[PDB]
Amino acid sequence: VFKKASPNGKLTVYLGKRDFVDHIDLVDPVDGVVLVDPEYLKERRVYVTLTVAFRYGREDLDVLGLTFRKDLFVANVQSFPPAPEDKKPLTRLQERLIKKLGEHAYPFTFEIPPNLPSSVTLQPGPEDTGKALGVDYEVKAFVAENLEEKIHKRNSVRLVIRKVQYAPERPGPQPTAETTRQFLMSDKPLHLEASLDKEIYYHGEPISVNVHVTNNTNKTVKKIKISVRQYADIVLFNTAQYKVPVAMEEADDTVAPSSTFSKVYTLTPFLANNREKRGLALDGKLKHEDTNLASSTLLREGANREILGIIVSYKVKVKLVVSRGGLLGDLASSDVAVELPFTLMHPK
């Protein structure tokens, strides 16, 4: 139970939480009563409104203007004269607030759509320009006429919400991948295998690159290299594969010709350790806070959602950098590497 009033002293907006879960089909219904000045807003009906903003950077084009922002889901609530269209239930927050207020307490309750995006922002560099860039939610209160749209700035209150995720109940399989030498080149390839412990991961819990070097070649003391990348793919827009590494961790091993090797590489990536990079997915920001790296967006159960959305997906990469067939290693630059996806979610 919060309190955020109109800074002309007009209307006290009051939402219950800020983060809101994503359930099975729906996510979470928004709620919240609104106590107002029941005489000072005369001839100005309280048409409160949710808003699902979407912005974008397009950091190549951003040197000219900005990118195409679009709304997604803009509902409205004529809150004070809401006689006929009655939303039948009553929240316990609404019940206790109705006990804790009076006639000016007009209530409100919203229902998010299922196949909309979730609360993600994007990491802005030095050129801040005030607004964030990701899918950000808002609850503005318009106590005015039908299409006034005036800047009654202290007389209209805004807020922010968060449709967040949680851990899926049943964790998935044990992920792995394998490939021989795509640079075989001598009728003798070189196999390779890697794996890790779980599929879902709470943040802070590390990676565990259980690997296997499987050599059958005559060369190639392979520098093993690990890389933790996220893939933010922005669906309806220019589907930018944001190949952003989070926290790399190299290795100084070497693959003897026709030998073998296995190890396990521990890796917790961190946000502030990887800070100051444009174009990556921070999680759902506050006004300004210590937000995690953005937890991975599940695909649609029944993946029939090419919505206007920004999906978030993580995968690791085992860079077996060997490249012996050249001058010294930089001339070949072969570096056989397979990848291995996974997820990451603040479970709560």
């Binding site: 203007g65 990118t67 174009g279």
Partner: protein
């Protein structure tokens, strides 16, 4: 004697010219390689996209190598030592091949750059439908290989001759083209049109349409999908229209005189032209190749220093080495 190949030029003027070429070489080499490494670290810093990063890299690479390759020989053997010509017959044939390939690289490269600038705004779907890293790599390798292949004719045309009063003389070898006059007219018209004319049309029309669409958005949100940059609706879009028109006027002003002088050599008749023009032609060569090298140096600051973000990382890296 040997005075038929005596380029009558004022020594103070040639000194001033050589100062200009030296200054442009210093700033072009330093700023171009600094732009290259700045941009490569900007892949390591902006860290989200490498769409046109490769294009700008190819352009900076082209400008760097054309400055460092062409500027020494074009200083000495043309502005300074006109008569003896001491840098090798197949050497000078390869030299003209190199400057032709480099001009073609810069030309078609800034052309493809502007076409990409168009294709970003006009079709916001089709770049993500085509332009992957593979598409960009194949694309710029295609542009580069075309710039290599179109240059092959100059290697087959720009000969050499001991064109003195006798064959054997003091320095009578002088790297003039040795093909027939119709042949050199054909290849110079081919080089001129293919290097500039449709680059002029492509750059001009595409950036004109880009400026028109930007101005139309400026007019539509002048009094206020949606696509609005409210503090930069004056500032950023003003800079945008300025630099778009600036890039095309820079390009036109900088490359029109150079192969304009080439065509002046082409459509030239000995009976038709007296010696007064000749001296003006040598001086015009000085001014023309000067403006072409400042062309080779101008484009990097207009494509990185126009932004402040690349100016941010560029200040970070130009402060790093020094």
């Amino acid at each position: 004697p040997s005075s038929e190949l005596d380029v009558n030029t004022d020594i103070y003027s040639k000194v001033l010219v050589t100062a200009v070429y030296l200054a442009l070489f210093v700033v072009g080499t330093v700023g171009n390689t600094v732009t290259a490494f700045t941009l490569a670290r900007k892949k390591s810093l902006q860290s989200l996209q490498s769409t046109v990063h490769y294009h700008l890299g190819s352009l900076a690479l082209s400008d760097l190598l054309t400055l460092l390759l062409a500027m020494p020989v074009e200083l000495y053997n043309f502005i300074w030592v006109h008569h003896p010509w001491a840098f090798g017959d197949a050497g000078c044939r390869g030299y003209y091949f190199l400057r032709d390939a480099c001009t073609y690289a810069t030309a078609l490269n800034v052309a493809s750059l502007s076409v990409e600038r168009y294709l970003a705004i006009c079709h916001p779907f089709k770049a993500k439908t085509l332009m992957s890293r593979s598409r960009t790599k194949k694309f710029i390798s295609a542009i580069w290989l075309a710039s290599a292949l179109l240059a092959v004719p100059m290697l087959f045309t720009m000969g050499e001759q001991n064109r003195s009063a006798d064959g054997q003389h003091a320095g009578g070898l002088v790297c003039t083209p040795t093909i027939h006059t119709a042949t050199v007219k054909v290849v110079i018209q081919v080089n001129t049109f293919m290097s500039f004319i449709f680059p002029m049309v492509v750059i001009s029309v595409l950036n004109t349409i880009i400026a028109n669409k930007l101005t139309v958005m400026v007019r539509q949100a002048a009094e206020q999908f949606s696509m609005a940059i409210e503090p930069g609706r004056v500032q950023a879009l003003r800079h945008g229209v300025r630099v778009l028109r600036a890039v095309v006027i820079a390009f036109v002003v900088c490359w029109l005189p150079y192969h304009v002088r080439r065509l002046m050599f082409c459509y030239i008749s000995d009976e038709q032209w007296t010696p007064f023009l000749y001296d003006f032609y040598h001086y015009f060569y000085m001014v023309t190749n000067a403006l072409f090298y400042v062309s080779s140096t101008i484009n990097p600051i207009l494509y990185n220093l126009v932004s402040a973000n690349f100016r941010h990382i560029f200040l970070a890296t130009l402060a790093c080495l020094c």
